[PDB]
Ligand binder design. Structure first.
Ligand SMILES: NC[C@@H]1O[C@H](O[C@H]2[C@@H](O)[C@H](O[C@@H]3[C@@H](O)[C@H](N)C[C@H](N)[C@H]3O[C@H]3O[C@H](CO)[C@@H](O)[C@H](O)[C@H]3N)O[C@@H]2CO)[C@H](N)[C@@H](O)[C@@H]1O
Ligand SMILES: NC[C@@H]1O[C@H](O[C@H]2[C@@H](O)[C@H](O[C@@H]3[C@@H](O)[C@H](N)C[C@H](N)[C@H]3O[C@H]3O[C@H](CO)[C@@H](O)[C@H](O)[C@H]3N)O[C@@H]2CO)[C@H](N)[C@@H](O)[C@@H]1O
Ligand SMILES: [K+]
Ligand SMILES: [K+]
Ligand SMILES: [K+]
Ligand SMILES: [K+]
Ligand SMILES: [K+]
Ligand SMILES: [K+]
Ligand SMILES: [K+]
Ligand SMILES: [K+]
Ligand SMILES: [K+]
Ligand SMILES: [K+]
Ligand SMILES: [K+]
Ligand SMILES: [K+]
Ligand SMILES: [K+]
Ligand SMILES: [Mg+2]
Ligand SMILES: [Mg+2]
Ligand SMILES: [Mg+2]
Ligand SMILES: [Mg+2]
Ligand SMILES: [Mg+2]
Ligand SMILES: [Mg+2]
Ligand SMILES: [Mg+2]
Ligand SMILES: [Mg+2]
Ligand SMILES: [Mg+2]
Ligand SMILES: [Mg+2]
Ligand SMILES: [Mg+2]
Ligand SMILES: [Mg+2]
Ligand SMILES: [Mg+2]
Ligand SMILES: [Mg+2]
Ligand SMILES: [Mg+2]
Ligand SMILES: [Mg+2]
Ligand SMILES: [Mg+2]
Ligand SMILES: [Mg+2]
Ligand SMILES: [Mg+2]
Ligand SMILES: [Mg+2]
Ligand SMILES: [Mg+2]
Ligand SMILES: [Mg+2]
Ligand SMILES: [Mg+2]
Ligand SMILES: [Mg+2]
Ligand SMILES: [Mg+2]
Ligand SMILES: [Mg+2]
Ligand SMILES: [Mg+2]
Ligand SMILES: [Mg+2]
Ligand SMILES: [Mg+2]
Ligand SMILES: [Mg+2]
Ligand SMILES: [Mg+2]
Ligand SMILES: [Mg+2]
Ligand SMILES: [Mg+2]
Ligand SMILES: [Mg+2]
Ligand SMILES: [Mg+2]
Ligand SMILES: [Mg+2]
Ligand SMILES: [Mg+2]
Ligand SMILES: [Mg+2]
Ligand SMILES: [Mg+2]
Ligand SMILES: [Mg+2]
Ligand SMILES: [Mg+2]
Ligand SMILES: [Mg+2]
Ligand SMILES: [Mg+2]
Ligand SMILES: [Mg+2]
Ligand SMILES: [Mg+2]
Ligand SMILES: [Mg+2]
Ligand SMILES: [Mg+2]
Ligand SMILES: [Mg+2]
Ligand SMILES: [Mg+2]
Ligand SMILES: [Mg+2]
Ligand SMILES: [Mg+2]
Ligand SMILES: [Mg+2]
Ligand SMILES: [Mg+2]
Ligand SMILES: [Mg+2]
Ligand SMILES: [Mg+2]
Ligand SMILES: [Mg+2]
Ligand SMILES: [Mg+2]
Ligand SMILES: [Mg+2]
Ligand SMILES: [Mg+2]
Ligand SMILES: [Mg+2]
Ligand SMILES: [Mg+2]
Ligand SMILES: [Mg+2]
Ligand SMILES: [Mg+2]
Ligand SMILES: [Mg+2]
Ligand SMILES: [Mg+2]
Ligand SMILES: [Mg+2]
Ligand SMILES: [Mg+2]
Ligand SMILES: [Mg+2]
Ligand SMILES: [Mg+2]
Ligand SMILES: [Mg+2]
Ligand SMILES: [Mg+2]
Ligand SMILES: [Mg+2]
Ligand SMILES: [Mg+2]
Ligand SMILES: [Mg+2]
Ligand SMILES: [Mg+2]
Ligand SMILES: [Mg+2]
Ligand SMILES: [Mg+2]
Ligand SMILES: [Mg+2]
Ligand SMILES: [Zn+2]
Lengths: 138, 235, 208, 150
RNA sequence: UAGCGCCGGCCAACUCCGUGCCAGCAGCCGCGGUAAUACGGAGGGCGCGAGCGUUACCCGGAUUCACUGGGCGUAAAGGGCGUGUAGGCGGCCUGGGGCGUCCCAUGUGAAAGACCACGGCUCAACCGUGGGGGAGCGUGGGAUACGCUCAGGCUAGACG
RNA sequence: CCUGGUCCACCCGUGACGCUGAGGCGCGAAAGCGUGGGGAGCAAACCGGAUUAGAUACCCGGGUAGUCCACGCCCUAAACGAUGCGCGCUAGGUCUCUGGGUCUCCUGGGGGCCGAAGCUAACGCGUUAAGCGCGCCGCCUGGGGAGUACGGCCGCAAGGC
């Protein structure tokens, strides 16, 4: 089975983006969905929507890229350069509000799970809560 | 500037194998173990392509016509000979773009020796020279024929088979020279800046596309030249 | 320690005119005028391309030999400036320029920094009215550096302060010539200094 | 216009019958200290031609460096081969803290205060290429929000 | 009163004479077998200076025990293979508890030391006054996304 | 004759029952050991003939243990893909073994080759990953000394860990 569903989703996205896929499906979970919301709001994906593959629930993630480029290797710049799982099963990472990181001096985000819900670094620091550090994206 | 249903032979692609998966978007379906190019998408990209061509043309930019494919070998040497455009026919010498100065030195030697066979000096020095220089001029005209017209790097290139000519394409991209091409199922679309998704094999398709292209050129620069004399090369 | 050796030889090694002599470094006797090449047997030979270390070492040696300060005190001053708020380089130069001996030179009670040192050590100088004989004393903004009332009749101070009539003192310093006193108004801005020195190279030297 | 400094020169050698045959490589950085750099590696029979050629190549390969108040916009970590470079931004007055190679490269790009670390293989050539790639990968808040418009 | 170390590269500083794989140097790479910038002396030079070198020891560089931050096809490194115990880890939905986790308040965190400012010895070293911190733990209240737990449900893993 | 694994189709049943796995336990080529049997060919040791400066070898003629069977030990290896197991994701082309299907073709399991992206010090790997990820186990930390010495456990011994 999947040991880390969230890591698996992040990876699906990474792999899909690298070959410039139009979209990609990931097995559906409310958690994954709540992550994808933040992801969309912050503008790393065009958006997501719920679909049914076979008889089972999935989330289509519509990825997003830059404009076609010049010179050799016309392939566009990635909107998601880096997406990485931080807290994993078997080592879990919890941070206090003073310990919340700052990704790429603001140019990136980090997604936290707090008791006030799934938030970004800005959002969490604003509501003044820490939580599990899920991943970092930039 | 017509096309539409007048495309005959174009939608025929290469075999089931030999393809490039990246071309999947430009494919309609697979008939008789043959990929068949999408009918509409062809015109779709044709618009944008010919628009770029028109703009570049009325601006006065030169286009380098390129193919060796031996199906398209005869077509290019006339179609490009129309208007002012240079062409590469026999083979693509490595560095024609990136090494362009050095290659141009050969053009200088070409018109040099033409000027030698002009003046009285043909019969000067032994037949040892007269036999050599003659063959030198021979091969120089064999290769650099259409290339002699370029005094400076082109503003775009036109390529018949981007897979076969892929070196030309490569240094075009290198020098940021916009690539126009006629792409078949066996080619990588991403390398082509303006794509014409059709058969690169049949003489009919090449004739149609290139002829209409030059027609668009001269139409952009005015004068509206008579219909192209490539139609007798259908053999 | 504080050196005590030939000076204009350093004028020569740093390849830039320094004034360690006060006057005569303005004369065409400075030997930097007549012999711009480095001291020693090999001075006139072609110099090989200096290593980055060479460059930084030399630059810092220029800065240090200007003020005639020992490496111990120099280093201490630098690390002190490093701990402080503000740009390390500018603060370094400020701290260097706040030294009593240097201030005395700046106010023109002495023709050279070394002479200023001697004037301080011998108690010919006063700060806010009390005698201070320490050349390394740090002046603060607002302090009044004057000449000892008992020393005002000395020939050297006559010569020096008579030569200071009509002369201008740095924007951070005020000078009352007749009363033979002066004030340290503020710390010098980097722009205020004419020093032939890239401080960032010094910072980089101790960065090693 | 263009300030230029060389990183390293080296003499390599091939083997031909009855002898060693030397060839000189040279690494050269060129920059205006306005935020444009370039790096090139020339190879020639003799040193000067190598340095010259290296300069030419360097001016041919250029990187636009998005400075913010004399420093870098954000931290990057780049691997070129086994060589790794870590660039991290610093407050003014810090200075350029780096090894010879990325120092020269950064200083010619007009960087005043920056923090670096060389990791893995310290090989000058690869560290240089790594640095260039690092500078090349730098984005600005402007660039970022340009990307995420949608 | 001025001394001490160094001048092949790393590493800032070069020439003459003596020596001839000797005498010797050397932290590593190395130098010396007739013309040594490397041995020994001299002139000169560089660096520190009431000190300057050497030896020993600790951290550093060393991302060279890699939590931050490493690796195992051929460089050192996948167990000869399986079965499985303990342990580590755990698919989707709902609910309860609030153990992990997070937040607010509060107690504790002696002085000296460390940081900042002001001040006393002519300065500094040294010292005085004041200020600011703070990980951890105790207590009271709160949150429930994630991890845990109890109860129920599903069939995409697994088995039949 | 007895018996293990495995693949496909149907979408029928249970309802997370899963993955890994220190120690333990079992299996473990050849050689070797014990008891009993067997012994054609081959063949360590050994007996000879050549070759050679010598030839304790290569070449030639013999030949014992052994190689074979049963039972019990031994536990090693270039025990190799020099690549731990499981799951998810990331172009294709071609050859082949083996199922199913509307049988040009499509779909599933296994074995090869060339190659997208990517990775790698390079060679190369590339849906049979050495790519992108997660879980768990084993192992490495400059070369010689040395897989040695000591201790312990195992073994009839040789010797193994
Ligand atoms: N030690 C006594 C204490 O000193 C305190 O003062 C402390 C600090 O303020 C002072 O720091 C000094 C000062 O010049 C300034 N604030 C910065 C400067 N870099 C430091 O100077 C020195 O500090 C210490 C020795 O004191 C050493 O590191 C070194 O000699 C030097 N850096 O050093 C003192 C400690 O040594 C308070 N007066 C009080 O707590 C008490 O008297
Ligand atoms: N060569 C080691 C192999 O590691 C595998 O697993 C490895 C990877 O799955 C895992 O990923 C690690 C990551 O944990 C750790 N935090 C950092 C490390 N760089 C990563 O490594 C990974 O990424 C890099 C690119 O950066 C790749 O070059 C590399 O191939 C890849 N293993 O780290 C593991 C140890 O290297 C197999 N389980 C093991 O059998 C095999 O021996
Ligand atoms: K990489
Ligand atoms: K580069
Ligand atoms: K002797
Ligand atoms: K010699
Ligand atoms: K000597
Ligand atoms: K150490
Ligand atoms: K092994
Ligand atoms: K400390
Ligand atoms: K025996
Ligand atoms: K069949
Ligand atoms: K490669
Ligand atoms: K191979
Ligand atoms: K074993
Ligand atoms: Mg990770
Ligand atoms: Mg805590
Ligand atoms: Mg800010
Ligand atoms: Mg910061
Ligand atoms: Mg500081
Ligand atoms: Mg500072
Ligand atoms: Mg430091
Ligand atoms: Mg040859
Ligand atoms: Mg930029
Ligand atoms: Mg690596
Ligand atoms: Mg600020
Ligand atoms: Mg290393
Ligand atoms: Mg030197
Ligand atoms: Mg010595
Ligand atoms: Mg030692
Ligand atoms: Mg001699
Ligand atoms: Mg002699
Ligand atoms: Mg000597
Ligand atoms: Mg030495
Ligand atoms: Mg001396
Ligand atoms: Mg002292
Ligand atoms: Mg000492
Ligand atoms: Mg040490
Ligand atoms: Mg350090
Ligand atoms: Mg360490
Ligand atoms: Mg470190
Ligand atoms: Mg070690
Ligand atoms: Mg680690
Ligand atoms: Mg390692
Ligand atoms: Mg190995
Ligand atoms: Mg194995
Ligand atoms: Mg072993
Ligand atoms: Mg769960
Ligand atoms: Mg559990
Ligand atoms: Mg709790
Ligand atoms: Mg305290
Ligand atoms: Mg005081
Ligand atoms: Mg507190
Ligand atoms: Mg509580
Ligand atoms: Mg609740
Ligand atoms: Mg709950
Ligand atoms: Mg249940
Ligand atoms: Mg089944
Ligand atoms: Mg069912
Ligand atoms: Mg049921
Ligand atoms: Mg198992
Ligand atoms: Mg076991
Ligand atoms: Mg066995
Ligand atoms: Mg056996
Ligand atoms: Mg037996
Ligand atoms: Mg027997
Ligand atoms: Mg026999
Ligand atoms: Mg025999
Ligand atoms: Mg014999
Ligand atoms: Mg012999
Ligand atoms: Mg026997
Ligand atoms: Mg094998
Ligand atoms: Mg294999
Ligand atoms: Mg195999
Ligand atoms: Mg495998
Ligand atoms: Mg295992
Ligand atoms: Mg299994
Ligand atoms: Mg297969
Ligand atoms: Mg097999
Ligand atoms: Mg291959
Ligand atoms: Mg590639
Ligand atoms: Mg290759
Ligand atoms: Mg296998
Ligand atoms: Mg895999
Ligand atoms: Mg081992
Ligand atoms: Mg081992
Ligand atoms: Mg050892
Ligand atoms: Mg060993
Ligand atoms: Mg052994
Ligand atoms: Mg022992
Ligand atoms: Mg023993
Ligand atoms: Mg025993
Ligand atoms: Mg024995
Ligand atoms: Zn002078």
């Amino acid at each position: 089975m999947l040991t880390d569903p969230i890591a698996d989703m992040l990876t699906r996205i990474r792999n899909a983006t690298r070959v410039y896929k139009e979209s990609t499906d990931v097995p559906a979970s409310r958690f994954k969905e709540e992550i994808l919301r933040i992801l969309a709001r912050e503008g790393f994906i065009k958006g997501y929507e719920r679909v049914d593959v076979d008889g089972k629930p999935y989330l289509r993630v519509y990825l997003k890229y830059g404009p076609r480029r010049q010179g050799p290797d016309p392939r566009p710049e990635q909107v998601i350069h880096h997406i990485r799982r931080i807290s994993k099963p078997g080592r879990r990472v919890y941070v206090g509000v003073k310990e919340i990181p700052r990704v790429r001096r603001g140019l990136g985000i980090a997604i936290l799970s707090t008791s006030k819900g799934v938030l970004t670094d800005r959002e969490a620091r604003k509501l003044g809560v820490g939580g599990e550090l899920i991943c970092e994206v930039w | 500037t017509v096309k539409e249903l007048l495309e005959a032979g174009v939608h025929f692609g290469h075999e089931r194998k030999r393809w490039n998966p990246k071309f999947a978007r430009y494919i309609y379906a697979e008939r008789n173990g043959i990929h068949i190019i999408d009918l509409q998408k062809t015109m779709e990209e044709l618009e944008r392509t010919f628009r770029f061509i028109e703009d570049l043309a009325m601006r006065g930019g030169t286009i380098l016509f390129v193919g060796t494919k031996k199906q398209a070998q005869d077509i290019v040497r006339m179609e490009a000979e129309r208007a002012g455009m240079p062409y590469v026919n026999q083979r693509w010498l490595g560095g024609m773009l990136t090494n362009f100065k050095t290659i141009s030195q050969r053009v200088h030697r070409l018109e040099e020796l033409e000027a030698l066979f002009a003046s009285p000096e043909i019969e000067e020095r032994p037949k040892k020279e007269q036999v050599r220089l003659k063959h030198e001029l021979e091969r120089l005209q064999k290769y650099l024929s259409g290339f002699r017209l370029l005094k400076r790097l082109p503003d775009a290139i036109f390529v018949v088979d981007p897979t076969k000519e892929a070196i030309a394409v490569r240094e075009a991209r290198k020098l940021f020279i916009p690539v126009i091409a006629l792409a078949d199922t066996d080619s990588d679309p991403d390398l082509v800046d303006y794509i014409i998704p059709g058969n690169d094999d049949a003489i009919r398709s090449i004739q149609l596309i290139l002829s209409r292209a030059v027609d668009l050129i001269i139409q952009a620069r005015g004068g509206v030249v008579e219909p192209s004399p490539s139609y007798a090369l259908v053999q | 320690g504080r050196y005590i050796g030939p000076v204009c030889r350093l004028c020569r090694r740093e390849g830039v005119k320094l004034y360690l002599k006060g006057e005569r470094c303005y004369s065409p006797k400075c030997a930097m005028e007549r012999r711009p090449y480095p001291p020693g047997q090999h001075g006139q030979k072609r110099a090989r391309r200096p290593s980055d270390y060479a460059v930084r070492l030399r630059e810092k040696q220029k800065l240090r030999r200007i003020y005639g300060i020992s490496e111990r005190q120099f280093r201490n001053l630098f690390e002190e400036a490093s701990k402080k708020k503000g740009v390390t380089g500018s603060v370094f130069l400020g701290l260097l320029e706040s030294r009593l001996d240097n201030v005395v030179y700046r106010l023109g009670f002495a023709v050279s920094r070394r002479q200023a040192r001697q004037l301080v050590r011998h108690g010919h100088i006063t700060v806010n009215g009390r005698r201070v004989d320490l050349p390394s004393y740090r002046v603060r903004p607002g302090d009044e550096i004057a000449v000892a009332e008992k020393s005002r009749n000395l020939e050297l101070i006559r010569q020096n302060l008579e030569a200071m009539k009509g002369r201008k003192v740095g924007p951070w310093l005020s000078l009352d010539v007749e009363g033979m006193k002066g004030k340290f108004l503020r710390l010098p801005d980097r722009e205020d200094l004419a020093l032939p020195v890239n401080e960032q190279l010094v910072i980089e030297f101790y960065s090693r | 216009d263009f300030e230029e400094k060389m990183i390293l020169i080296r003499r390599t050698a091939r083997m031909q019958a009855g002898g060693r045959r030397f060839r000189f490589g040279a690494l050269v950085v060129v920059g205006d200290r306005q935020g444009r750099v370039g790096l090139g590696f020339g190879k020639a029979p003799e040193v000067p031609l190598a340095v010259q050629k290296a300069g030419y190549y360097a001016r041919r390969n250029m990187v636009e460096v998005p400075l913010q108040n004399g420093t870098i916009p954000h931290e990057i970590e780049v691997e070129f081969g086994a060589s790794k470079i870590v660039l991290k931004p610093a407050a003014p007055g810090t200075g350029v803290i780096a090894g010879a190679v990325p120092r020269a490269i950064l200083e010619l790009a007009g960087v005043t205060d920056i923090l670096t670390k060389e990791l893995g293989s310290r090989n000058p050539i690869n560290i240089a290429y790594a640095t260039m790639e690092a500078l090349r990968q730098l984005r600005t808040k402007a660039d970022v929000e340009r990307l995420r418009k949608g």
